Design a protein around this ligand. Structure first.
Ligand code: CO
Ligand code: CO
Ligand code: CO
Ligand code: CO
Ligand code: K
Ligand code: K
Ligand code: K
Lengths: 377, 377
């Protein structure tokens, strides 16, 4: 049966992502010097202004200003006529520093409560929903061609949204595509439309999916010239769905960036991506969504639900069974199973935390063991 | 089949909610004077500090400081030993003001792109998932008994999380309950546990659902004495799931508070709650989730999906059909259908935007017409 579904993505340099990247840049920077630092670092950015505020608990000494400005420059906001300059905006910070003050460390309990969700589906090479995969790929492409002089009239800020029509479970093709890139005053709009069609859209989207019918909307309102923080507000934790799975699978409250791995909100979610992906690369089901939860000071998850939406090749009790045998879902266990105490996190902060294959949670190393304990098959 | 599911809520005065309430307090305050003001007003609160920053476009003159402080006082943070004082914290603001500069206004296009989701299910009197209903009810109760001198040793900040076990679709009962209230240095912990059991938990949760087996965790880590902004960070748009449906139904990126109704992220989501609830009070299905999307400058939604998860009493094409006949889903249509240009919004900012019955989107006024166009039945 037909039905359509949509998902959105935004580039590096959309204001909430500028915030996400800065936070994580500070997370990495401390993790480089002190892999066991506790950090929670929420950023806010606004037209003149980056306020990076935190509670951090570490040895490390790190230069918030310098870190901030460098990140703003990588994204490329470097002159007042863009809307924001990395070399002259104000960076205020408000980071409270705490200097660091059971038998089996794996038994330490959850830092805070929470529910968190993970998905995979075999609809993609990366085991991700197609819409969120393609939306991310449009916006990536736009930062790519910007950065590499191909299309150098184009400025950082940009959104993509792709809407896919499916008949039963099966992607039929692409009903609409929308892309809106900040660009210089130099280029004008029909010429831009050809360019993004040539260079961002046609080389990313599968042709078989595009038809005579695909409604494309490229800068629909025209002249997107000042963007980024100018006239807008980024805060960490706002593009929370884009981070995940574009609205295909569910979400607990929680944001990732600027939280170190002791934070279940990040880790437990990475681990759930990891269990669900392994469940599917193993041929245990076609789609798998999984809810974990935790309660403060208990170590075991208060809840595990698995939902393979009628797509299992083994009954489900047996599934949740081996969910538990192959995975240490306790707070310190996650951190062990995925080897998290490293400065890996800024790369996460833009184009999808998931679907991207060199992160510890994307590897399908438990594939076979899951298969051949799922009976033997 | 058994499986469990969890949802979380937080009180007024959890820091992200303090932010949510302040933003919305400014939204209402302008809407009182200028119902057509465009406002987007993101707040950030941190130990000394409320930064309320915005882009606003209105006639209205309003006192951000005074508004902020009053809201902080209603929640009750009123003395340094709580962690935050409404009468002496600093309120900085950064609001850019713009003074206001097609044939059928209903045809004006979407302000921005987005996907948004709505749900109902007949699992509750209010047509909401039970977990998110009960979690909100625990935290409400805790603000209630605090505020009305029953339990006056208790301070604002608090979280609840309830985990429900279901056999097929049918709530069986409550596996675990967690509640963690900030409290004065006066009361200690065993005495507090009796009190919250007597006065917050036993009078809110259905008894038939509680058993011999219900794992209750009340202040698990003990002594929650300073809370609110002290040592933490609120930002608007962080308790985004709690706002919705606790993780039962899906989410687009988007936050509500501090956005006026021209903002699809709010409105379209309220309208989706409205269509889905009417679909179920009409007996068209048991659970209905609905995805709407929009693209910038188009007026019609780019996408409508309805998902009545095998629970329809009419086939689905016919459903999406009458989804379209009974509802004006265009940006200005939503605003018409739900009569939004009023100062109604601060009440939204704490305990659930939905499930709460005197908001324009909760009324089931299209009930019958939907029934008797759904064939006649
Ligand atoms: Co935003
Ligand atoms: Co949280
Ligand atoms: Co928070
Ligand atoms: Co948005
Ligand atoms: K964070
Ligand atoms: K959020
Ligand atoms: K907002």
């Amino acid at each position: 049966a037909k039905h359509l579904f949509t998902s959105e993505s935004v580039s590096e340099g959309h204001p909430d992502k500028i915030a996400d990247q800065i936070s994580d840049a500070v997370l990495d920077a401390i993790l480089e010097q002190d892999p066991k630092a506790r950090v929670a670092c929420e950023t806010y950015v606004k037209t003149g202004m980056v306020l990076v505020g935190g509670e951090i608990t570490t040895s490390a000494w790190v230069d918030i200003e310098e870190i901030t400005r460098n990140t703003v420059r990588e994204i490329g906001y470097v002159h007042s006529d863009m809307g924001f300059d990395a070399n002259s905006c104000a960076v205020l910070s408000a980071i409270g520093k705490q200097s660091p003050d059971r038998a089996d460390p794996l038994e330490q309990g959850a830092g805070d409560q929470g529910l968190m969700f993970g998905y995979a589906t075999n609809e993609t090479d990366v085991l991700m929903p197609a819409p969120i995969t393609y939306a991310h790929r449009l916006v990536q492409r736009q930062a790519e061609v910007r950065k590499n002089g191909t299309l150098p009239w184009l400025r950082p800020d940009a959104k993509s949204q792709v809407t896919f029509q499916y008949d039963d479970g099966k992607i039929v093709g692409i009903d609409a595509v929308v892309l809106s890139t900040q660009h210089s005053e130099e280029i004008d709009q029909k010429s831009l439309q050809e360019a993004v069609m040539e260079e961002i859209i046609k080389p990313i989207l599968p042709a078989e999916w595009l038809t005579s019918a695909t409604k494309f909307f490229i800068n629909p309102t025209g002249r997107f010239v000042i963007g980024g923080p100018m006239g807008d507000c980024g805060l960490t934790g706002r593009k929370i769905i884009v981070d995940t799975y574009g609205g295909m699978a569910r979400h607990g409250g929680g944001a990732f960036s600027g939280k170190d791995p002791s934070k279940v909100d990040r880790s437990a979610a990475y681990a759930a991506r990891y269990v669900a992906k392994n469940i599917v690369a193993a041929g245990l089901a076609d789609r798998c969504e999984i809810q974990v939860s935790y309660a403060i000071g208990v170590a075991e998850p208060t809840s595990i639900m698995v939902e393979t939406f009628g797509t299992e090749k083994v009954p489900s009790e047996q599934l949740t069974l081996l969910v538990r045998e192959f995975f240490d879902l306790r707070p310190y266990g996650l951190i062990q199973m995925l080897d998290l105490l490293h400065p890996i996190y800024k790369e996460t902060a833009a184009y999808g935390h998931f679907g991207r294959e060199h992160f510890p949670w994307e590897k399908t190393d438990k594939a076979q063991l899951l298969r051949d304990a799922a009976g033997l098959k």
